């Protein structure tokens, strides 16, 4: 339960190469004398795997993931590796798939196991008359809520701790396909010391149990043998690899056994075998794949610098509306400049709820409403959500999910007119609380206490509708203030006002993603000498394809060329002759990808010789390749 081992010696993290291993049957379909291809979670060839041992100086049991493919190839000498541990989090919170082996049966239980930091098995009492008997069981602590149990056939496992070179090889592939856990097994005798044989081995399915759990991490159950923290293991080594959904070509004999497999996505010589569907490829040039340049960045040079919003009729208008019967205006399809007001340092209160005004230049919205009225000096704090006053309780209440702006500035020299300004009214009393975006034009007498007013004024009875009034000889709290209340929202319409940083440029000589006014895709811009008309924004060729655009800010004409693409050809020799490669990337130079440029494309792998010979393998433009000394 809490027993840990301290007999682990530090080793450098080396790796092991896999030449032609990691091929199993994708299904239960009998195929004979055919060359068919399949695509499933197989091991890619010429890859590097991890380095773990299960011996008496290295004893490792890490926590490795499961979703990135699991390839378990291990050599066994003294029967140390017994089973495997699967599960989501490997604790009591989620389910776990536990496979144990007590040298009599392969016990598979699906319960809520609680594992420790290093599960193992105990083979102890090796002083005298040992006979390799099991002593302890330290896999898990407890289990509850079991759902499945599988008992295999009984057998006799030799628990003798033999040393020396390995004589057995066991390969396993674990995966989960919609809850059905499939286990592949293959056993073949080998003769090596440390590494794995660089040959071929086809794995066969053994069991298929409908577990139905999610597996994200997995471990490996090991044993201990020595002739509670000082015990050592026997002689074993396991290498864990990752599977990738690649294309593999399988060869079937008359008996249906897979004899050879070639990974298609490894080298261009292997791409010819999967295209022609033949393991024996003669001398010639064949199509292998298709080349495509991957873009790096993605800029959107869609909007221009014109079409500014006329904010002079909203902030500096001649007359606003009332605070209880206001008229909401819609302003869209323009560019609202809000940075010249925050940096002016002349506003009394410049705040914006939802999005800060420093972030409004880099934030997109659908539209923006307007709500302009004239308030007093003490009513600046009243136009705010979650507040009170003569406006927030009687005239206009802001909602909790407010995404607009509260803009305030001193307008003592603006609202001062000859004879006074009495064109604005406000409510002073109300019978109940307010609602968000609610108007009120009633003139009913408010009743404060239990005494009725009977429609006339008196004790705690006043008229709700009052008029504004200000004097220049008053204090700060009685000055008129012009305020503009905004309202941002998101609709099904696209964004019309965001603010494109008041400046736009154009990047050329690079295949990247672009989003223009009449073309969206990947391309690389080059210099040109064309002259566009002042109303045109983009140009097309005779093929009705946009290949020339215009900068919306700079008066320059730059044509856009799309990124290079085309088929990939190779020059392949005979199967029993050589395995050299010469990749030919068509419709591209030798810079965007034995270097020689042709009219068909860049050829990498062939040395340019000035001497002329007979054309063996044709390429194009009078250039051919051959195999000479």
């Amino acid at each position, epitope marked *: 339960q809490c027993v840990n081992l301290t007999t682990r010696t530090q080793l450098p993290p080396a790796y092991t190469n896999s030449f032609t291993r990691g091929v199993y049957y994708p299904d239960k379909v009998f195929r004979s004398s055919v060359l068919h291809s399949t695509q499933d979670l197989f091991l890619p060839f010429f890859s590097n795997v991890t380095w773990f041992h299960a011996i008496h100086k290295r004893f490792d049991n890490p926590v490795l993931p499961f979703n990135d493919g699991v390839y378990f190839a291990s050599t066994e000498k003294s029967n140390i590796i017994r089973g495997w541990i699967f599960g989501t989090t490997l604790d009591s919170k989620t389910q776990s798939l536990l496979i144990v082996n007590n040298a009599t049966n392969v016990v598979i239980k699906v319960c809520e196991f609680q594992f420790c930091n290093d599960p193992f098995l105990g083979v102890y009492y090796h002083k005298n008359n040992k006979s390799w008997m099991e002593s302890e069981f330290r896999v898990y602590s407890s289990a509850n809520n079991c759902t499945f149990e599988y008992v295999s056939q009984p057998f006799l496992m030799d628990l003798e701790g033999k040393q020396g070179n390995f004589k057995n090889l066991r390969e396993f592939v674990f995966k989960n396909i919609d809850g059905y856990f499939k286990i592949y097994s293959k056993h073949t005798p080998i003769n090596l010391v440390r590494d794995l044989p660089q040959g071929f081995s086809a794995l066969e399915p053994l069991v298929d149990l409908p577990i139905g759990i999610n597996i994200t991490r997995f471990q490996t159950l090991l044993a201990l043998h020595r002739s509670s923290s000082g015990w050592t293991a026997g002689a074993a080594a396991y290498y864990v690899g990752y599977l990738q959904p690649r294309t593999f070509l399988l060869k079937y004999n008359e008996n249906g056994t897979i004899t050879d497999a070639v990974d298609c996505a490894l080298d261009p010589l292997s791409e010819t075998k999967c295209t022609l569907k033949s393991f024996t490829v003669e001398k010639g040039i064949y199509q292998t794949s298709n080349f495509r340049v991957q873009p790096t960045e993605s800029i959107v040079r869609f909007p221009n610098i014109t079409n500014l919003c006329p904010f002079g009729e909203v902030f500096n208008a001649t007359r606003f509306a009332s605070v209880y019967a206001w008229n909401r205006k819609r302003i869209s399809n323009c560019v609202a400049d809000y940075s010249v007001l925050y940096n002016s340092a002349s506003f*009394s209160t410049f*705040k914006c709820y*939802g999005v800060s005004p*420093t972030k409004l230049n880099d934030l997109c919205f659908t539209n923006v409403y307007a709500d302009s009225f004239v308030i007093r000096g003490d009513e600046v704090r009243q136009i705010a959500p979650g507040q009170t006053g003569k406006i927030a309780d009687y005239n206009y209440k802001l909602p909790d999910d407010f995404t607009g702006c509260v803009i305030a500035w001193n307008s003592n020299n603006l609202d001062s007119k000859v004879g006074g300004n009495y064109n604005y009214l406000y409510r002073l009393f109300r019978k109940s609380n307010l609602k968000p975006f609610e108007r009120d034009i009633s003139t009913e007498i408010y009743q404060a206490g239990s005494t009725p007013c009977n429609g006339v004024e008196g004790f705690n009875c*006043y008229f709700p509708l009052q008029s504004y009034g200000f004097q220049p000889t008053n*204090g700060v*709290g009685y000055q008129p203030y012009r305020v503009v209340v905004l309202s941002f929202e998101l609709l099904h319409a696209p964004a019309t006002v965001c603010g494109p940083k008041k400046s736009t440029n154009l990047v050329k000589n690079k295949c990247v993603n672009f989003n223009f006014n009449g073309l969206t895709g990947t391309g690389v811009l080059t210099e040109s000498n064309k002259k566009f008309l002042p109303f045109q924004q983009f140009g097309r060729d005779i093929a009705d394809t946009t290949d020339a655009v215009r900068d919306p800010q700079t008066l320059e004409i730059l044509d856009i060329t799309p990124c290079s693409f085309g088929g990939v050809s190779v020059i392949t020799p005979g199967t029993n002759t050589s395995n050299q490669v010469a990749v030919l990337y068509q419709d591209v130079n030798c810079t965007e990808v034995n270097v020689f440029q042709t009219r068909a494309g860049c050829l990498i792998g062939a040395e340019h010789v000035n001497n002329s010979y007979e054309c063996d393998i044709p390429i194009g433009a009078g250039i051919c390749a051959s195999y000479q000394t």
Partner: antibody
Amino acid sequence: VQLQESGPSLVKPSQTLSLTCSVTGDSITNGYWNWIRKFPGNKLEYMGYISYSGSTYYSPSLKSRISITRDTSKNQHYLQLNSVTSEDTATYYCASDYHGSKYYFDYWGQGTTLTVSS
Amino acid sequence: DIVMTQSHKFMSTSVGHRVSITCKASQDVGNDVAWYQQKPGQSPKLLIYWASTRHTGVPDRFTGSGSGTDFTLTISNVQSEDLADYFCQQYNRYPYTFGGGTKLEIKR
């Protein structure tokens, strides 16, 4: 601007509560002055608000058991609670919420403790 | 209603370090960020309003910034008298209730 809280130490039940918060440095003519109480154990509760018109609205927990008055000549405002009980035992505080000279001023006092029980 | 999820409710810093209190809002608040400082045995006081300007009378060691939903109070050179509970106040609707609170402690 500095506020000061005052009140009796113990209040008999089934009576009228009395509190006094004086506002020094500025007369109460523009802004909003609140009454926020705090239970022992770092738990504050907001009761209600008072507007400039005089009509007040409170929480639904205290519908007609709290009255807030103000006076523009004495530069202070009072707090009265009718039908007091053991739930009103809290540490009251006073604050000032107003704008001016492009700054957000929020000044507080010291605090008073009123213990009401049966 | 927007609840300010406090990342730290109890911090132990020394004199001269930087206090980092982060109140991640569930929705977009913008200038709806308020910082209060309630000393033990004293009254609370508004420290940072609208995440742009400090209160009059506060020294220059208290500052703060942020945008969107990520707001972090910056207290440089915290003295011994700064041991108080910091609350993140929202102006969504009434009542004017406070949050959980972040109490600072001298590391001993």
